[PDB]
């Protein structure tokens, strides 16, 4: 019998946002520019991207809860490069 | 039927097994490069296997809810002002991912309750009450994401374990270090070199 | 050829931001790729530190732990 840990964690993976196929790709990409032949783990793919995703969507919030405007907001790169100066690290 | 329910069950357990088999699957960098590696076969059977739990609770008519902390509803008591929580919590409360407000939405909410409620409140002090709780939820909805993630991380491989090796080996801690510098380094360089290439699209 | 703009929109707006400007699509390709190159490099220093030939999912946990809040708690 599987317990509901299992089935949160598969229901998690199924939420990405990002393909995975070009995913695993810029992972190969990567380790060709850093020249290293090392093989990977599956599971070690699936965290790299787990971890991606919500790092980007922190940058994203963290914009977000840096401007204070109320006026319809477009987000730019200056305002990414403020929230992270303040909220980052 | 009780067989049935019985049978899914099994049939999880085997999909399960399959996905930690693929799991440990070691990759070189061809099969990184292979749109059927084990990676991509890995989220389809993961796919597979939560349509299967859908159809086993509609089995057991039980919810098919797994737990998640994201499915909880976050409370917002924070102000004096029972319609501007109520109308906070209901904006937070969103059906759906993509709840997240900005600021704008939350400011919209305490003036739209303030208004309805005429309760006499200076844009001085609506503004604060604004700010203070665009504050409090949103940091509220990122800790709930990150909860989310931890909760959620890895596998059966990261389910056993662990110490970090670095801390019984000071050459690997110097080495750490220095990757973190050039890490910090290299994401402040991308950062700033959008940030100019906005003032050079300006100016 | 690489990671969508129709992705990188869900991003930000699971995040709270519904508009984002024309450069904020190649910023996010920039950083997503900064990020991996980041944890990839402690992984692998884990890796080759252990004198092991394949990365394993621990290495990227340990080398998570070193990118800030991301894990924090784990």
């Known amino acids: 019998t599987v317990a509901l840990r299992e089935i949160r964690r598969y229901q998690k993976s199924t939420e990405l946002l990002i393909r995975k196929l070009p995913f695993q790709r810029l992972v190969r990409e990567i380790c060709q520019d850093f020249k290293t032949d090392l093989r990977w783990q599956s599971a070690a793919i699936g965290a790299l991207q787990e971890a991606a995703e919500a790092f980007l969507v922190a940058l994203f919030e963290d914009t977000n809860l840096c401007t204070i405007h109320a006026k319809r907001v477009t987000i730019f790169p200056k305002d990414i490069q403020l929230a992270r100066r303040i909220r980052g690290e | ?203 | 050829q690489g990671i969508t703009k129709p992705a990188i929109r869900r991003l930000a707006r699971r995040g709270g931001v519904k508009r984002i400007s024309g450069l904020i699509y190649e910023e996010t390709r920039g950083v997503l790729k900064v990020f991996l190159e980041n944890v990839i490099r402690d992984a692998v220093t884990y890796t080759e530190h252990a004198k092991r030939k394949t990365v394993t999912a621990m290495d990227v946990v340990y080398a998570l732990k070193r990118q800030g809040r991301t894990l924090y708690g784990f």
């Open chain 2, 1 to 203: 039927s009780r067989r049935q329910i019985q049978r899914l069950e099994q049939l999880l357990a085997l999909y399960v097994a399959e996905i930690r088999r693929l799991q440990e699957k070691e990759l070189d960098l061809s099969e990184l490069d292979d749109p059927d590696s084990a990676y991509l076969q890995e989220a389809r059977l993961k796919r597979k296997l939560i349509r299967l739990f859908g159809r086993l609770c509609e089995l057991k008519d039980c919810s098919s809810l797994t737990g998640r902390v994201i499915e909880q509803r976050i409370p917002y008591r924070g102000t004096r002002y029972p319609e501007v929580n109520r109308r906070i919590e209901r904006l937070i409360n969103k059906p759906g991912p993509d709840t997240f407000p900005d600021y704008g939405d939350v400011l919209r909410a305490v003036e739209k309750a303030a208004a309805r409620h005429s309760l006499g409140l200076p844009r001085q002090q609506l503004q604060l009450m604004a700010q203070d709780a665009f504050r409090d939820v949103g940091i509220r909805l990122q800790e709930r994401r990150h909860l989310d993630l931890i909760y959620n991380f890895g596998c059966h491989l990261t389910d056993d374990y662990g110490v970090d090796p670095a801390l019984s080996d000071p050459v690997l801690a110097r080495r750490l270090r220095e990757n973190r510098s050039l890490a910090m380094s290299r994401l402040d360089e991308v950062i700033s070199k959008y940030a100019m290439l906005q003032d050079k699209s300006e100016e």
